[PDB]
Amino acid sequence: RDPTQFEERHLKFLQQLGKGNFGSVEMCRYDPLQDNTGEVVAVKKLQHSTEEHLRDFEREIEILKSLQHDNIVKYKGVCYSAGRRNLKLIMEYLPYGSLRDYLQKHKERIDHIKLLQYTSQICKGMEYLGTKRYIHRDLATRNILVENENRVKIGDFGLTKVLPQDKEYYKVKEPGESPIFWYAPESLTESKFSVASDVWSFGVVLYELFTYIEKSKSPPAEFMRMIGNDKQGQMIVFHLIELLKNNGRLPRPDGCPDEIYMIMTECWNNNVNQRPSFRDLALRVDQIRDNMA
Ligand SMILES: CC(C)(C)NS(=O)(=O)c1ccc(-c2ccc3[nH]nc(N)c3c2)cc1
């Protein structure tokens, strides 16, 4: 038996782990003995599995299968349906859930030492991703998972793209739902995505962490306040571009160490080439952890 080949009729629904546009993730027991002793796994599937969606999903699956890192969720295998060949991605189950939910739950009971451990791990997962010339395009605390108190992993790759051989950016021609409040300026203006725009987004994740996911302080809430809550639809993007151009930025989170705030603001450079590298961010964060401890 090839253990990466999962028979769908043996997957028992336990609970839903998340849903949105395109897909959902469910906690399931893979229980071929049918006695409730099988392994519990995470199962990602498509809500709307059109030809185009399935094509993208299969690339996503290949991306995840190609990544082996302590801070990247583990690929376990796939399901194929008969006939139209619907696909399910089977992953390890990380029982503490998303980092967004975890931090929202425990708040300041997670101390700065812990937050920086998570930061370093996110940085390392991202640096590793970049070595494979993959661009994540969706880095947010909702996409990061908690294995245990001491380890987080990047948990979703639904928007991940491979760079063209001869280019250092990927251009999206027809944008779908876009997490615009995590986007670099050049992603908003030109739909250009690169390691450097992933670094911009990482700065936003660092902000999320240090606000402890306080809803009033969320990137959407803050940017909307800065451009005006009256702005709607496409005018949000117009005003956001103008704001960023003029160095409008998320504020320093309350109680945030200065060295950490400085990292955020460096990630949020309008000049793409001046943004730090993930290799350097991981070094810098580990040094800060070292100084604290
Ligand atoms: C991507 C999508 C639209 C489906 N929803 S989301 O972003 O809320 C999300 C992402 C990953 C997961 C996910 C993916 C793999 C997982 N392994 N163990 C987990 N707890 C776990 C969770 C769940 C929800």
List keywords for this structure.
monomer, 293 residues, alpha+beta, Phosphorylase Kinase, domain 1, 2 domains, 5-stranded antiparallel sheet, two-stranded antiparallel ribbon, globular, Tyrosine-protein kinase JAK2
Describe the structure.
This protein has 293 residues and is an alpha+beta fold. The chain folds into 2 domains: 1-93, Phosphorylase Kinase, domain 1, CATH 3.30.200; 94-290, Transferase(Phosphotransferase), domain 1, CATH 1.10.510. 38% of the residues lie in helices and 18% in strands. The chain is built from 9 helices and 11 strands. The protein has helices at residues 51-65, 99-106, 112-131, 185-190, 195-211, 219-227, 234-245, 258-267, 278-292; strands at 11-19, 23-30, 39-46, 75-80, 87-92, 134-135, 144-148, 151-154, 161-162, 170-171, 192-193. The protein has a 5-stranded antiparallel sheet with strand order 1-2-3-5-4, with helices on one face. Strands 6-9 form a two-stranded antiparallel sheet. Strands 7-8 form a two-stranded antiparallel ribbon. Helix 3 (112-131) runs antiparallel to helix 5 (195-211), helix 3 (112-131) runs antiparallel to helix 9 and helix 6 (219-227) crosses helix 7 (234-245). The protein starts with 10 loop residues before the first strand and ends with a helix. The relative contact order is 0.11. The structure holds 4-(3-amino-1H-indazol-5-yl)-N-tert-butylbenzenesulfonamide. Residues 17-20, 23-25, 42, 73, 91-94, 97, 142-143, 145, 155-156, 158 line the site of 4-(3-amino-1H-indazol-5-yl)-N-tert-butylbenzenesulfonamide (5B3).
